[PDB]
Design a protein around this ligand. Sequence first.
Ligand code: FAD
Ligand code: FAD
Ligand code: BDF
Ligand code: CL
Ligand code: CL
Ligand code: CL
Ligand code: CL
Ligand code: CL
Ligand code: CL
Ligand code: CL
Ligand code: CL
Lengths: 451, 451
Amino acid sequence: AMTKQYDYIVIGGGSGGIASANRAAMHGAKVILFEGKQVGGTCVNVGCVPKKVMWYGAQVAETINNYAADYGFDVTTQAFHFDVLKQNRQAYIDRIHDSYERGFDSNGVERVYGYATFVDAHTVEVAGEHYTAPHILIATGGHALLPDIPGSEYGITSDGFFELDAIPKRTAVVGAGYIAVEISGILHALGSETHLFVRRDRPLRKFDKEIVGTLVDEMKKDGPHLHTFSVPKEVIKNTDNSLTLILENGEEYTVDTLIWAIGRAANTKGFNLEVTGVTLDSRGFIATDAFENTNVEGLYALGDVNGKLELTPVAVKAGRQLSERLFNHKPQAKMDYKDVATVIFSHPVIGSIGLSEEAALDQYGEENVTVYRSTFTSMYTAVTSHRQACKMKLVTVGEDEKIVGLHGIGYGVDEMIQGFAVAIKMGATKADFDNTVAIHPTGSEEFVTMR
Amino acid sequence: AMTKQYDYIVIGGGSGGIASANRAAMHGAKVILFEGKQVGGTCVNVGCVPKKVMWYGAQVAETINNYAADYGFDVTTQAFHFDVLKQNRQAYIDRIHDSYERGFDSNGVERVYGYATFVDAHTVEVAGEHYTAPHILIATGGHALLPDIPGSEYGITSDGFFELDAIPKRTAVVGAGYIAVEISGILHALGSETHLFVRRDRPLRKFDKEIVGTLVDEMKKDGPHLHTFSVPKEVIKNTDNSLTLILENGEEYTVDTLIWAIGRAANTKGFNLEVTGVTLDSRGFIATDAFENTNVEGLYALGDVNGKLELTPVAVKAGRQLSERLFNHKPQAKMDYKDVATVIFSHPVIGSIGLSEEAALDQYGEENVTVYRSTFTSMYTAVTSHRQACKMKLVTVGEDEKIVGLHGIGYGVDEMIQGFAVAIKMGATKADFDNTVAIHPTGSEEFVTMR
Ligand SMILES: Cc1cc2nc3c(=O)[nH]c(=O)nc-3n(C[C@H](O)[C@H](O)[C@H](O)COP(=O)(O)OP(=O)(O)OC[C@H]3O[C@@H](n4cnc5c(N)ncnc54)[C@H](O)[C@@H]3O)c2cc1C
Ligand SMILES: Cc1cc2nc3c(=O)[nH]c(=O)nc-3n(C[C@H](O)[C@H](O)[C@H](O)COP(=O)(O)OP(=O)(O)OC[C@H]3O[C@@H](n4cnc5c(N)ncnc54)[C@H](O)[C@@H]3O)c2cc1C
Ligand SMILES: OC[C@@]1(O)OC[C@@H](O)[C@@H](O)[C@@H]1O
Ligand SMILES: [Cl-]
Ligand SMILES: [Cl-]
Ligand SMILES: [Cl-]
Ligand SMILES: [Cl-]
Ligand SMILES: [Cl-]
Ligand SMILES: [Cl-]
Ligand SMILES: [Cl-]
Ligand SMILES: [Cl-]
């Protein structure tokens, strides 16, 4: 069987691969995409989408349990059917799969649902057939890490969290990143006795400290039990099938399910990447330049596998810009990785753009940083017996007070950030914010009324 | 008793008057403020604040009644106690009152809770005493209009809506503006058989037609009963105390409560404004220049009474800018009334900045306008049996596609608009939006991923 020629081969049908394959096809490239598991990759199947559906479920629980009575509603929960939530979650995800397949047909992207293995730098094997192209994108994503301790195998990862068919009575979540925080918040809201174990002082250690302080204070009021300076030593499986987590400090916790959310690493093994000559960086990600080029001409890498910024919209935009470059004659087209906004679906949620106050002071010096901050109680919660704080801040630099960081935590913050991210990308200053008329009554107006 | 001398007299203790009085006092002016009713004016007592608390109660109802089951929560409502909601709403408002009084004391603003009547162009009478100043601000607000038909007196206005101590079993809401749409939306969510009557083909006629199309479709699915081409002829009070609304088309609707939300007019009567020589415009508002000057030196007018834009933050900023000009040596200080964002707390919410597609076409010409859109189902509702559309639109002009209009309708839109308002005030183009990385998964990202 002769080797099949293509203009572009995309390895991975996740956010990055789909985005790049579709854009290449829209510019006339003969493109083929390979996916060894399910279309949509991590975000659609075991990431952002199912996480957000579950977060909405947690919002519903909070409404019923914490706020309804104070708005006059005397309600009783006859039962909670996790299976109903999961079936509706999966039906939504299946519709997303269908949409991607309709998109490939429309754009003319060929795809084979099979695992791709390199034969040489410009050739891969899938289901026994060989395929070659002068352009090959490695968009293979990452995977969850497991600690190297006795009993590590008794824990599950975020993938296993989505495989659950019921809320465990008691759950341990180990980790200090956004995934650990999100999962632990959802589990607590949905009724699990939830314990969050962070290795050092607090979760989200690199985030703005003032904002994370409120996260910690609110979790204490309504959230998982937080255990600081908690370093896992071992996990024991007891006779009754429960798990006991043993920490280096000697403390022990018994739970039904234990979730490792300690980090993610690049998917670089199992597909004969070594024959390509592609170099990895010191953290194990595929090394790339500003244009997603590996060290080998005709091989590119983007999305989670390049380690730059593990977010769906980053993979999508980088993938689209690469295709603009390779197939639409734009040698300068590339991803802009600066001031990318994020939202962490904690409870309450955190929204962030740019530098923390700590990073700004480190970079610019205390004499050149001016911080504006507003702290209040979200109106939604203010009238109830479960009042919740909201903290917002603008980190500015220089005489013209250019906004280099914007952060908030509180009810509704998840939908506030995107617009401000446009303004920050345009170089907004405090004056630009002052020139904007507030929208009342909203939480978002507090960002433009600080003084 | 001689006439008391002041630097500044503010007639009205609402959003505009409070803001202007406080800022004038901060710059050393001897200021006195007069308020004939409650401190805080319309927004605090019978406007934005109580409206928003009620809207949150409606959102809780929607969660319980429409979405909870599909998230796996089988919930029953034993009772709805409107009194609980109202008491918490009033407590919140009372705290605002207290904070204003403390602020006046701190800032050095004198106030008398009495109605002010003009004696001459520079002198007012309050509780028998005379007061004079070379600067007098008329910030008297507006009032709800009542139709001139038999039985008009049986209806209440939005003030009466806040006086209600229970949700009426059946409610008629008459009008086509944001107040009618918001009130009818709240009444329906909270359980009233609600009928909304508009005089022409649709509500919110000045808003972008495609956005209103979604509003109408969603209202037909889940909202009040909408009656178009419906002009009130008379209201009959029946022997059982119900009210029958009779329309010019012959239809009759029997309800328990009827709310007139047909428009608001300036407060210009009853305080001897005629002796000042202040000119009114053809719509009955106090005419003013860009600096809030009336035609009479030493007399100013801002907030709802000047007719420019009926919004709290507008009244606040105009009042502050006026005090900057009069008392802080800033002759060019003034309000910027262009591209002021608004949110309408309809079901679902509408957010808007700038020109509708129709207005942009009229102004710039068809050859010079380009529109972008996103139409989807909000993820929150997508997994339920009450799926709700979300629609977003960018209206752009010229070769650079400057954004002159931004509009959205759907879940969470209320918190999305503020940040985009900053970007538009900075002169954002479609390229500036394209340059901004999306935040996923949110509704807000759909504003920056249109093609
Ligand atoms: C729990 C969780 C929550 C998250 N929440 C968010 C969020 O709220 N917002 C956000 O922006 N991001 C979020 N992320 C991150 C987001 O999911 C990733 O940044 C994104 O999926 C990366 O896209 P990608 O294309 O690089 O990789 P992936 O989507 O992981 O795609 C890689 C694909 O390649 C396939 N593959 C690998 N090797 C081969 C091979 N040899 N042959 C064929 N196929 C192969 C895999 O099967 C996989 O489907 C979350 C991640 C997790 C784990
Ligand atoms: C139902 C409703 C909902 C609303 N929702 C919103 C919203 O969501 N967002 C928004 O931005 N805006 C909203 N508004 C509009 C907002 O309330 C007004 O734009 C704002 O209150 C106007 O402020 P003002 O200072 O001009 O007038 P007001 O706040 O009305 O203050 C005028 C004051 O002057 C007093 N007064 C009048 N004459 C005299 C006199 N001779 N002597 C002494 N005192 C006098 C009155 O008692 C009154 O307190 C809403 C309005 C209504 C009615
Ligand atoms: O007004 C609250 C709200 O609209 O804020 C934005 C989103 O968080 C929504 O879930 C939420 O209902
Ligand atoms: Cl795509
Ligand atoms: Cl797992
Ligand atoms: Cl359960
Ligand atoms: Cl990681
Ligand atoms: Cl029309
Ligand atoms: Cl305008
Ligand atoms: Cl167009
Ligand atoms: Cl979403």
